[PDB]
C-alpha cells in the first residue's frame, strides 16, 4: 500500500504543524520534528488517548512483529524482514482537548471503514466470478412464500 | 554587497514568522515585530564558520532549509517557496562554498525501515529514503522497555527563557522495535552520544495483574493523587478520590485471592460500564517492592500509612496495603 506518491498529493491543509488525517488516501500525517510524515491506516494498529493535565497525550500504536495483530500469517501488514526495524508507537500532546478528541475519533472511524472494506472484499475474494443466469423466456416454474 | 533576505520564515517551528537574511558573516533570523511574543526580540545569528552542510526538503509550511552546524546542532528554517530554491542554492554556494542538497522523503506510509544514527540526528529510513529525522538535542532521555524495544522521550517544549513559542501538536515519545540478537547495542550508541540519564517514576508499579472485570491483563501504576491501569488496548486513569471501597476476598477454590475496587464514576469501554474492578491473584504469588519516595516525603506524608519496603509477602496483601495508604479507604 502507499500513502502519497508526490509531495503535491499531500493536501495543503497539512500547513498547521498538527496531526492531519486524509480519509481519501487513508493516511494519518504526524508532525515529527517539522516533518509531514504520512502513516497509512493499514500500518496503524490501535490507539490510546489520555488527557494528562492541560495536554492530551494520545499514543498511536503501529503493527510490530511478535504476537501483534490477529491477522493470520498468510497476509502480513508489513513486508517480511528480520533486519527491518519498526515504529511501534508515537505519543503526541496538544493544548486543544476537543479537536484532539475529534482527530482520535476520525482515526478510529477510518480504521473501522478500512477493516469493513477488507472483510467485504474477502467475502467476495475466493468467490469465483460466475456466469450470468439465463432467464426462461416463458412462464417460469415458481415456489412462493 | 547584495544581502538576500526572505520574509515569512520560521525558526525551529516558531509560531511567529521572521525575516531571514544571508550575509558574508553568516545567517541571521529576526522575528517580525507584528506579534506580541512575550520573549527576547534578539536576532538569531549563526556564524559562517559554524555551517557544515545545508539540506533542502519538504516541511509543513512549504520548503525547509535544514542547516547542519559543526557543533552537532541542527537549525530548521521553514516557510520557503519552491522558486526560492535556485536563489538560495546560488547564494549559499557563493557565500559559504557549501552545496545545497535536495533531500527527498519517503511518503509510502510504512512504519518499518532502518534506523541510522547520523552525527547530529537519528534518521528513520523507509525504502532507502528518510521518512523522518529527530535531532539529538530534542531527545531528553532514552530507556530499554523490553528485549527488542527502545523508548525515546523528547524534551516537552513548554516555557524556556531562550525558545520561541511552538505552534501545533508536539511529539513527546517515540518507541522503536529493533528485532534480532541488537537493540542493546543501538541503545548504548545513542545513550553515549548525548549522555542520556535514566529516570524512575510512579511510587509503585505492579505488572501483569489479571483482571476478571474488565477481562484482560493490566499494569497498575500508583501515584499520589491517581491510579493508572495500563492495558494493551486500553489505558485508564482513576483518581484516588473516585475509589469508594476496596474488598479483599479469598476465592472458595482456596488457590486464588480476589481484590475488588468500587469506582465512581464507573469505568467505561463503550455502552455498559465497570463500577467494580475485579482482580485475581494466586495466593502463592509473592512480590518484593520498594516505594519510589524520598525519605523526607515518606516521613512527612506516608509514615504509618505505607511501609518504605515490603518484604517477600503475598502480592494481594502488598497491593491492598498500598491501595489503603494512597486512597485512605478501609479494606473490607
Strand content of chain B: over 45%
Largest interface: A-B, 58 and 49 residues
Order of helices and strands of chain B: EEEEEEEHEEEEEEEHEEEEEEEEHEH
Largest sheet of chain B: 8 strands, mixed
Strand order of the largest sheet of chain A: 1-2-3
The run of helices and strands of chain A is EEEEEEH
How many beta strands in the DSSP annotation of chain A? 6
Overall structural class of chain A, as computed from helix and strand content, comes to: alpha+beta
Q: So what's the oligomer here?
A: part of a larger assembly
- Share of helical residues of chain B: 10-25%
PDB class: transcription
Keywords: chromatin, nucleosome, transcription
Entry title: Co-transcriptional histone H3K36 methylation complex containing RNA polymerase II elongation complex, Set2, and the upstream nucleosome. (temp115, FACT-hexamer)
Chain A: FACT complex subunit
Topology:
The structure is cut from a larger assembly and holds chains A (145 residues) and B (332 residues).
Chain A: E1 20-22, E2 27-31, E3 36-37, E4 44-52, E5 55-62, E6 85-93, H1 97-125
Chain B: E1 4-11, E2 18-23, E3 26-31, E4 44-47, E5 51-58, E6 63-69, E7 74-80, H1 84-96, E8 100-102, E9 112-117, E10 121-126, E11 129-135, E12 139-146, E13 149-154, E14 170-177, H2 183-194, E15 204-213, E16 215-222, E17 226-230, E18 235-239, E19 243-250, E20 256-268, E21 273-282, E22 286-290, H3 295-302, E23 309-314, H4 315-327
Parallel strand pairs in B: 5-8
Antiparallel strand pairs in B: 1-2, 1-7, 2-3, 3-4, 5-6, 6-7, 9-10, 10-11, 12-13, 13-14, 15-16, 15-21, 16-17, 17-18, 19-20, 20-21, 22-23
Amino acid at each position: 500500500y502507499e500513502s502519497y506518491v508526490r509531495e503535491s498529493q499531500i493536501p495543503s491543509k497539512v500547513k498547521n504543524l498538527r496531526i492531519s488525517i486524509d480519509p481519501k488516501a487513508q493516511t494519518i500525517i504526524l508532525p515529527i520534528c517539522g516533518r509531514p510524515v504520512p502513516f497509512h491506516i493499514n500500518s496503524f494498529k490501535n490507539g490510546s488517548k489520555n488527557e494528562e493535565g492541560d495536554y492530551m497525550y494520545i499514543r498511536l500504536n503501529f503493527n510490530s512483529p511478535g504476537m501483534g495483530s490477529s491477522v493470520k500469517k498468510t497476509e502480513l501488514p508489513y513486508e517480511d524482514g528480520d533486519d527491518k526495524e519498526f515504529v511501534r508507537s508515537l505519543t503526541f500532546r496538544s493544548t486543544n482537548k476537543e479537536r484532539m478528541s475529534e482527530v482520535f475519533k476520525a482515526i478510529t472511524e477510518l480504521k473501522k471503514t478500512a477493516v469493513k472494506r477488507d472483510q467485504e472484499r474477502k467475502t467476495m475474494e475466493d468467490v469465483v466470478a460466475q456466469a450470468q443466469l439465463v432467464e426462461f423466456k416463458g412462464r417460469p416454474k415458481k415456489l412462493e412464500n | 554587497m547584495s544581502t538576500v533576505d526572505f520574509d515569512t520564515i520560521f525558526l525551529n517551528q516558531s509560531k511567529a514568522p521572521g525575516r531571514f537574511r544571508i550575509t558574508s558573516s553568516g545567517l541571521g533570523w529576526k522575528p517580525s515585530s507584528q506579534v506580541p511574543t512575550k520573549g527576547k526580540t534578539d536576532p538569531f545569528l549563526l556564524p559562517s564558520g559554524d555551517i557544515l552542510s545545508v539540506s533542502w526538503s519538504r516541511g509543513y509550511r512549504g520548503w525547509e532549509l535544514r542547516v547542519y552546524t559543526r557543533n552537532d546542532k541542527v537549525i530548521m528554517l521553514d516557510g520557503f517557496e519552491q522558486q526560492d530554491f535556485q536563489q538560495l542554492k546560488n547564494e549559499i554556494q557563493r557565500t559559504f562554498n557549501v552545496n545545497l542538497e535536495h533531500k527527498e522523503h519517503s511518503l509510502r506510509g510504512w512504519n518499518w525501515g532502518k534506523t541510522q544514527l547520523t552525527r547530529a540526528e537519528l534518521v528513520f529510513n523507509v525504502n532507502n529514503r528518510p521518512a523522518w529525522e529527530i535531532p539529538y538535542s530534542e531527545i531528553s532521555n532514552s530507556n530499554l522497555t523490553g528485549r527488542h524495544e527502545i523508548s525515546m522521550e523528547l524534551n516537552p517544549k513548554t516555557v524556556d527563557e531562550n525558545h520561541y513559542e511552538t505552534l501545533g501538536d508536539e511529539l513527546v515519545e517515540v518507541r522503536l522495535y529493533v528485532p534480532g540478537q541488537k537493540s542493546q547495542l543501538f541503545y548504548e550508541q545513542l545513550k553515549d552520544k548525548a549522555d542520556f540519564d535514566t529516570t524512575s517514576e510512579a511510587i509503585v508499579s505492579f505488572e501483569d495483574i489479571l483482571f476478571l472485570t474488565p477481562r484482560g491483563r493490566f499494569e497498575i501504576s500508583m501515584y499520589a493523587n491517581n491510579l493508572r491501569l495500563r492495558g494493551q488496548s486500553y489505558d485508564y486513569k482513576i483518581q484516588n478520590k473516585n475509589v469508594l471501597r476496596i474488598f479483599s476476598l479469598p476465592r472458595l477454590d482456596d488457590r486464588h485471592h480476589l481484590v475488588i475496587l468500587q469506582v465512581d464514576p464507573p469505568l467505561r469501554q463503550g455502552q455498559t460500564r465497570y463500577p467494580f474492578l475485579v482482580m485475581q491473584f494466586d495466593r502463592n504469588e509473592e512480590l518484593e517492592v520498594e516505594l519510589n519516595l524520598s525519605d523526607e516525603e515518606y516521613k512527612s506524608k506516608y509514615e504509618g500509612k505505607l511501609n518504605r519496603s515490603y518484604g517477600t509477602d503475598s502480592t494481594y496483601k502488598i497491593l491492598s496495603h498500598c491501595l489503603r495508604g494512597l486512597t485512605e479507604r478501609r479494606v473490607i
